[PDB]
Amino acid sequence: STGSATTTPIDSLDDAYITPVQIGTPAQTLNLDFDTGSSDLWVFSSETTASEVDGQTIYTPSKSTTAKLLSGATWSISYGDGSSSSGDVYTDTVSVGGLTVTGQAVESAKKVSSSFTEDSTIDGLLGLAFSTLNTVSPTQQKTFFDNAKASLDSPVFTADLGYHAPGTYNFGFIDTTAYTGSITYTAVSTKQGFWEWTSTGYAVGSGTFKSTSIDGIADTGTTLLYLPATVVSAYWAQVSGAKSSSSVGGYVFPCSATLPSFTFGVGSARIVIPGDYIDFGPISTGSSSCFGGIQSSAGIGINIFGDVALKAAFVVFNGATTPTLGFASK
């Protein structure tokens, strides 16, 4: 089998992407944030504290003839941005772009943090990291991809995120018309539960390529590109007036600047992030100070190839017995 679904930026900055997901019978369509950096499928629901729901579409398991309470199961998650959610668990039928899993754990939120409440466009998350990170207790549950894998034509999914435009998540096949040149595959460590890999280096603008190993995660659920302070300083040094602002919480630059591109290595291959992808707009409405899309990972504890990086590529998440990651230009 295969699946194919369009993913759409939630706003003009590509802060995140939403993908429609059908849950239950009859289908209840919710717009979920597909997150290769976590492993829980959780949704706003009829059980969510009413004061914490503000415009989201909710899953109502009592209206689904295929919903079954997973007795005794609870979940609770905290994300790298400080947001969190928790609740109980149902199993139900879940379909993404034509691909159907029966008995998928659907984690129903009883509580969500303010960040989620405040974002009306995201109805929940669909985790696509390794199932070892799933937070369901006392019986850990599998991700949608893990449940679908054996049925897929090929045990892969791909992320083709757009810049200021819709893109696509495919399951079970590689669309050879969606990228240019070849896909370069690179090794993955699953030891931390993430799609963790090692980039071979970087360049800033038309500068020379620096060969250096950069361990990090391919994370569709993180907006920006978080890299070591040395790399980030080298980038922003090429932008007149750019500076790290402790008050704002990262590098800012004059909105009047033209940003240089940023290249990262995948083996001997190179992915180029155009400068415009690195502009995240005014720090506050009407400001002439703009927020940078490349930021330091110092104090995160891990480098994160988030959307800024991934959207410059066609990305293969290969869930073969030994997982790998593939990157192509597009």
From Swiss-Prot:
- Keywords in alphabetical order: Aspartyl protease, Disulfide bond, Hydrolase, Protease, Signal, Zymogen
What does the record give under GO molecular function?
Answer: aspartic-type endopeptidase activity
Swiss-Prot/TrEMBL GO biological process terms: proteolysis
Q: Does the keyword Signal apply?
A: yes
Q: Which cysteines are joined by disulfide bonds?
A: C255-C290
Record EC number: 3.4.23.22
Record-annotated active site: D35, S199
Q: Which reaction does it catalyse?
A: Hydrolysis of proteins with specificity similar to that of pepsin A, prefers hydrophobic residues at P1 and P1', but does not cleave 14-Ala-|-Leu-15 in the B chain of insulin or Z-Glu-Tyr. Clots milk
Source domain of life: Eukaryota
Identify the residues that the record assigns to the Peptidase A1 domain, covering every copy. 17-328
Family per similarity comment: Belongs to the peptidase A1 family.
The name on file for this protein is Endothiapepsin
- Shown segment, full-protein numbering: 90 to 419 of 419
